[PDB]
Each structure stands twice: as C-alpha cells, then as structure tokens.
Design a binder for these strands. Structure first.
Lengths: 82, 93, 107, 98, 82, 98, 93
DNA sequence: ATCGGATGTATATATCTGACACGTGCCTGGAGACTAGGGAGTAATCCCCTTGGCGGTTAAAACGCGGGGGACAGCGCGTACGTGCGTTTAAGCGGTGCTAGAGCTGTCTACGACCAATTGAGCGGCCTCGGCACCGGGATTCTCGA
DNA sequence: TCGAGAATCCCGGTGCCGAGGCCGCTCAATTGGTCGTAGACAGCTCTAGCACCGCTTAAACGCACGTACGCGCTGTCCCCCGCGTTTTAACCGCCAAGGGGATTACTCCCTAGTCTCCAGGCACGTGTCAGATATATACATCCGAT
C-alpha cells in the first residue's frame, strides 16, 4: 500500500475556505499549489521529528504527544492533548 | 493505571470564580496541558537561574524572579502578591 | 497525629504535595525550597483564575454554561498580557478572533 | 431577472461566518491520507492515533490561517485585495522560514 | 545624577549608517524617531530582565552573562561572552 | 564645474563598504548613557561591565540591521526604494512584535 | 579562579584541519560559547525525551536521537556516524 | 440617494442526548515525624573595575542647499477572479472484524553511583614576536558629461 | 559615447600586542571496587488502529461570465541624496577613589532521606440537562431601478 499525490487531495475550495477564515477577499490561482508546497514543507518537519520521538519511543504507532513535543521544540506548542 | 490531573482543582477554582459557569472536558484537558506547560516553563527557568547562581537548592525567591521574567508586567506583580500571601499564610502555619 | 495538607495550610486548592513530588521528579535542583511549591502553585491558581474567568465571561456572553475552547481562544486573544504570555502558543479548537481589516470593507 | 451579489460580498460573509465558526475546514480522510503518505517517506507502515492526526490537522490549519492572515496584512501593505505568491514567500522570509 | 533624553543621542547619521549596512537606499524622516522608539522598546525588555538576573544575583553591577541569559530567554542568543 | 554623484550612488557605496566593514556604527558613550538612563527607570545607581554594554550595543545593532534588512525587503514588495514607517510596523507585526 | 574552557582543543582540532591558521581570542570565546550552547541544547533535549520515556538514564541512543532531532540532513547523518564510530572505538577496549 | 425584492441571518421552539456533574470504594502519595549534612548565609578582606572627571581633535554631527528621482495620484484596460449554477464525487457514519502493537507485570542483571586513592591534563601566568593594523603613495577602475 | 575625475586596490614599510608557546601547579580525571537498582527483556493482555465495505450526501470541479482590481504609464512634487560648511563631543588618554564583587572561613537551618499511616484522588458507574440540532419566523442587509 504505497501512497502518493494526496497533496492535491487538498481542494482549492478548502484552501479558499481557510483563506476566508484568515479574512482574505481576492486570491490568485498560483497560490494554491504553492500553498500546498509550504503545507508539505511545514509538515515535512514535524512528522519526521514526531516519528523521531516515536523512533526513540521504539513503537510502531505514532501518538499525539509526539507532535506536542515537536511543536514545543518547533516553538508552536499546542494544548488539549495531555 | 492511575493518571493524575487537575480537573478537580480547575473545577474547584472555576466554582470559586464562577459557581454557575460549566466546563467542557476538551477545554478541561486544554487547561491541564496549559498549566503543565507553564509549570515546566517556570521550572526550567528557575533551574537555569539557580544553575547560574550555581545553587543546588531552588527556593521561592528564584520563583518570584523567574515568574517576573515570565509574566508580562502587571500580571507578575499581581501574581507575586498572592504568592507572597501564600508563603506568608504558610510561614504563619 | 493530626493531619493537615499544605494546601489547606495555605488555604488554597492546588496540591502542594503533588507539585512538590512533581518538581522533585523533574530533576531541576538537588534541594528545594519548601515554600517554593506553595508559591508557584499560588501563582498557577491566580493565572488559572484569570483565564477561566475570561473564558466564563465569553461563555455566558454566549449563554454558554459549559465553556468551549472557542471561549478560551477568544479570552486569550482579547487580553494583551495573556496574549503576550501565550503568543506563540496554539489552542485546539481555537479558531481566530473576529478581525476584519479596514480596506476589506467595500466603500 | 436573476440576481447575483457583487464580488467579494458572498466571500465577505464567508469570512464573517468562518471567523464566527471554529471547527475544521479540511476534510478528515484526505488530510489523513496525506499524512500517512508523508510518513511512509521516513518510515513505512506506521500507525497513528486519531487524536494524534486530529492534532496534526488542527495545528496545521492554525499555522495556515496565520499565514493567510499575515499575508493578507502584507497584501494590504501591497495595496491590493488580490494575493500574490511573493507575499507568501516573503512572509515566510520574515517568519524566518527561508 | 538623573539621566534623560539620550534616545535622541542616537544620530540620524548613525541610523542611516545602520540602514546602509542593512542595504537600504532611500529612507524617510518619519522612521528615525519611530526607529528609536522600537530600539527603546526592544532594550526596554532586556535590561530589566537582565537586572532581574542581577536582581536574583543580589549585586549592584550588571554583567554580560545577564543579557546573555536574557537574549537566550529572548530567543536571540549571542556568542563570545562566556 | 562642480561634480556631484547621482543620488544613492554615494549611499550605494556606503552600503557596499558597510557590508564590507564589521565594526559598530554607533558612538559608544551616547549608547551607554541611553542604557544607564533606561536602567535607572527600573532601578537607580546600577553599575555595568564595559563588556556587558558592548554586548548590549552589538546585539541591539544586530537586531536593528536585521529589522532594516527585512524592512528593505518588504519595501521591495512595496515596490519602493524609499522606506515607510508602516513597513517597519508591519514587519514587527510579522516578527510577532505587536 | 580556575576557569574551564575548550580553546586548547579548539586550537588542536584547528591544527587538525588547518595547521597554518591563527584565531582571534575573541573568535575562540565565541566558538566556546557556541560549544556551550549546543551542549546545553542537546542535554536539555535528551533529558526531556528521557522524561517522555520516563527514563532516568541518558545513553547514546538518546544522544543520537536528540542530535537527529536537532541537526538537519547530512549534518545529522555525519554527526550520527561520527558518534557511532567513536563510541565503537571506545567500547573496543 | 430610496425603495423593493432576495436573500441571508438571528430566535423560539422541542427533544435527545451524551457528555457530564456527581458519588464510591479503593488506592499511595501526601502528610507526619525523625536524622543528618552542608548549602546556604554572614563576615571580614582584597582588588580593582567602575565610575567619576579633564583636555585636545576631528571625524563626525548639524545644518543648509539644490535638485533630479521617485512617491504618488490619476487613468485606461484587461485579464483574472468571484459567483451562482450546473455537474460529479469522494467524504462521512457506522458498524464489522483482526490483531500488532501498545501496554501492562515480573524478573534479573549489568551498570553507573560513589567513594577512595592517585596525578597529569590542563589552566593561570609569563615572555615574545609577526601577522596584522596603519599609513603613504602609486596605480585602477566607476561615473558622469561629450 | 572617450576623457576627467574620483573612490578604490594594492604595494611596501612600521610598529604591536594579542596569539601562542611554555612553566609551575593542581584538582579533576582515572582506576578500581561494590551495590542497589533501571531497565532489558519475556511474556501476557486488548484495543485502537487498521482496513472493509455500504449508504447518503454534502461537498467538490468546472462553466460561464461579469467585472474590477492589477497593472501599466504620465506627470508632479517634493524630498531625500550629495556636497559644502560649521560646530562638538566621542574619543582617547590619563588619573583617582571606592564600592562593590569576589573570596574564604565559619556555622547551622533547612532539606533530603526514612518510615507510618491514611485520606484525598482516581477509576468507575449513573442519572441528567446544555446545548445540538431542526424548523418556521422575523429582522438586516445587499443590489438594482428610480
């Protein structure tokens, strides 16, 4: 089960929904994929670092506390998950 | 497996401030995580300072200093007062 | 052998004994100031009081008994001091406070 | 005669209700599939908590709306209501993301 | 010996020198004092926090290691001072 | 006939030599007086290390040239060669300094 | 007062990489401060992860994992390989 | 600038409920009591960095002074983007079922902890001298009017 | 556009002190026992994840299309760059006082560590209403004709 191309699984309607939440009126097309890239790049770090935790955790499943400590180490800490 | 928390304490202080207002478990665990984070903040900061003082003991003066470092202005002021109150109330034990 | 917890001895809620054990197991200093747990827990009591108070303010502002994390986000975004305290912090189910820029409105 | 609201107006109300709403704006399963796809890059066949992935998507979307927000702000400084990729790039630049 | 108004002691030539170092060609006047303010605000924190260290240090003179640990705590750490 | 270089050109060379140079660009004593003035606000009659204040001024000027740098960048995105205060303000805004 | 540093080992590894080079004592102090920074970084991260693992023993696995968390790409890879080779050498006797 | 119509949104209502407030029995961390050491606190001493001032210099700052250069305002157009309506589509509920892997307990053991005895790797301190910083001068190259 | 001129690059020479090398002089590193214990590991659960599959549908993609902001261009103003001059105070070098910083030596208050006991906390059941949801309704607001 080898996955691929779920990045475009991000719908442009979803992107513009997030933008409207951010309070944006007019948007260009060139953004979305660009956006996506950033998205990827962003998560590009955390999961790895997260599984890095799981790396040292010696476990096969990945937990929330992983990304908790990541965002912490990434200076983007989050609440509500222990 | 016993998992400690502070939902009891957060609910206590909730009632102490708002006996009427309720609470959600999601926001409850949010509160818990948050207080854990800020407690680790103050712990690391005070330990760092004491290490700078090279003092193997961690006392309340360290706590006051480091929370002053942590809190934006007036909060700390307010904060330290009650803290002092606390230790006074506890030193007067 | 009369018993009285240090929290009652401080007339407060946060467990001085529990937090003391926690900081002990936290490996920050060899010895500790016995009143430092009291002091810190009092500070926690205070700040928690303020944040939950603002949360409940938003809650009954929305006729909401049980507080929702959205109330929490709004509270932490309204107060300058607390927002500064938790600027780079994120909140689950937080959302964004109401904010529309000037030029966004049509003329 | 058919009526059509002026441009932005509908999107304006969308902005208003989205600042009103708080829940996610991303479909769960696509995000999850994307996460697992990213995961197999570093190691294959790794499991996850639904809570974990919910945290991933929430924190992501938070970072994303923050990026959209300050890029909106920059575009204000760009005196445009349309967004430009360079705005996002330079925003990351100021965000130290370059 | 009560001090005052050393903020304007920052010369506009100094400001434009720093700007040229930052690679800036054309500048407006409205910046400098504004600049100064920021400057103040910026240092507004550190010294206090620094002397806060000195506060706990129970000393009358202020040391570099103070601002070292401040910038550290301010996430703007610096090297070359122990 | 007197010669005058075109605008910016001299300032351009100044930029070049300043990126060439590395030393401070602020007079020591004024900065020190400013620091002590700020200090007496929180507590009066406090002494300092020359090393300490040298660190203060160096770190400041570093933050300052960084601010000037990315504000220059923003002004590029503002398509101007002149700087505007709003550029600095919004830069701090993106720098989370608001 | 006996103060400890590393500038001697700085000069050593310099000659190991550049025998015909001098340094400003200023730069040496800067590099030593950098050494201290990376050391405290890695140590804190290791202690924190061990706390997450509830471990009271910080070992080389923790070291490697925390470096990977900190260093990027080939930096981390080379550092991991180097630490591995060195601990192998030390364990060989 | 107004009115009319469309539409979208705030409200009351009803009920459903599942989180949620509430109460339990049982567990162990917290309290209570006791012992030691030794980190911390105090004090006298030294040093010595700092903070203060004084005089001469000029590079630097203040200030002025055109003036070309661009900030900016406006103005045409057009392409790209909101929108509302089509279309089709995976998203979500939900419920099933297996187990891989977390997640727990019980060993037992290697492994630092720790202390004690030993000391040479390292560090403060002392020459020393050579890249390096400064300077002056000559040659090179950019730039602004042809 | 080929020169004039100007800022610069480079070259040789001067003098210097930091970079460095070496020297006394430890204490902190090593070595070697020794011990209680962190966890390594085995070996159990069970459950949460993982995938399956169906059913409904809100949602997503694309279309057409108006349209309106982005963009590109022009002319203006003013204004900040560049240079010239005049003023000054940073700097720099030196001196001096003391006041704090650091040090060491005592001294002992407080905390770590131990042991006892139990009571507040925690997992776990348990009714139960805050509010989620849906519906019809009444109010607000845009958009186009006037």
């Amino acid at each position: 089960k080898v996955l691929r191309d779920n990045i475009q699984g991000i719908t442009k309607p979803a992107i513009r929904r997030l933008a409207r939440r951010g309070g944006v009126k007019r948007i260009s097309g060139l953004i979305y994929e660009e956006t996506r890239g950033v998205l990827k790049v962003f998560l590009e770090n955390v999961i790895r670092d997260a599984v890095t935790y799981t790396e040292h955790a010696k476990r096969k499943t990945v937990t929330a506390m992983d990304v908790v400590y990541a965002l912490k180490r990434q200076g983007r800490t989050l609440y509500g998950f222990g | 497996t016993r998992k400690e928390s502070y939902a009891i304490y957060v609910y206590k202080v909730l009632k102490q401030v708002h006996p009427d207002t309720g609470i959600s478990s999601k926001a409850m665990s949010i509160m818990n995580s948050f207080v854990n984070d800020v407690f680790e903040r103050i712990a690391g900061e005070a330990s760092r300072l004491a290490h700078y003082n090279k003092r193997s003991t961690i006392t309340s003066r360290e706590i006051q200093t480091a929370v002053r470092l942590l809190l934006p202005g007036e909060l700390a002021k307010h904060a330290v007062s009650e803290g002092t109150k606390a230790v006074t109330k506890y030193t007067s034990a | 052998a009369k018993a009285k917890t240090r929290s009652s001895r401080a007339g407060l809620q946060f467990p001085v004994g529990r937090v003391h054990r926690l900081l002990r197991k936290g490996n920050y200093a060899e010895r500790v100031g016995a009143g430092a747990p009291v002091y810190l827990a009092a500070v926690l009591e205070y700040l928690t009081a303020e944040i939950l108070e603002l949360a409940g303010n938003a809650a009954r502002d929305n006729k909401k008994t049980r507080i929702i994390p959205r109330h929490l986000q709004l509270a932490v975004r309204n107060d300058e001091e607390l927002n500064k305290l938790l600027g780079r912090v994120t909140i689950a189910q937080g959302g964004v406070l109401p904010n529309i820029q000037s030029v966004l409105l049509p003329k | 005669k058919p009526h059509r609201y002026r441009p932005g107006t509908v999107a304006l109300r969308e902005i208003r209700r989205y600042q009103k709403s708080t829940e996610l704006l991303i479909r769960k399963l696509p995000f999850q599939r994307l996460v697992r796809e990213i995961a197999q890059d570093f190691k294959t066949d790794l499991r996850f908590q639904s809570s974990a992935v919910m945290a991933l998507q929430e924190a992501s979307e938070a970072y994303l709306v923050a990026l959209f927000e300050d890029t909106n702000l920059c575009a204000i400084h760009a005196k445009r209501v349309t967004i430009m990729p360079k705005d996002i790039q330079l925003a990351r630049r100021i965000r130290g993301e370059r």
